[PDB]
Amino acid sequence: MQQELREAFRLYDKEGNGYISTDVMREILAELDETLSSEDLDAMIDEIDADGSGTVDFEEFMGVMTGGDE
């Protein structure tokens, strides 16, 4: 089961490895949700940035991508 939730993440390890820039996660959210707009997803990314040049960590991605795994 290589195509688990990591399926999407691994595809974005083009620039960076394991710590993808928050930029890309915006597009990920747009690929996931149908109702919220780019401003909505951007605002969620706006508050998730782990400060690493604008990056998201593994579990940070996991928690948000699963809807809300707190």
Side-chain angles (χ1 to χ4, degrees):
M1 288 65 179
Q2 59 174 211
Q3 235 67 215
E4 230 283 73
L5 295 181
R6 267 64 63 197
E7 63 180 288
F9 196 100
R10 66 171 184 101
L11 303 180
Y12 299 125
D13 291 285
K14 49 171 182 57
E15 299 166 76
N17 189 330
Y19 299 86
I20 56 177
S21 307
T22 48
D23 192 295
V24 72
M25 188 175 187
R26 297 186 298 183
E27 222 55 44
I28 303 180
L29 298 180
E31 282 297 302
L32 196 285
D33 195 76
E34 184 189 280
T35 35
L36 57 79
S37 187
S38 308
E39 187 182 274
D40 294 281
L41 61 82
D42 191 272
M44 293 185 299
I45 296 303
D46 187 267
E47 57 171 72
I48 192 186
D49 171 35
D51 178 76
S53 303
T55 45
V56 183
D57 210 292
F58 183 77
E59 187 168 280
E60 297 177 329
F61 170 78
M62 291 292 301
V64 182
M65 190 65 180
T66 48
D69 179 60
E70 47 192 80

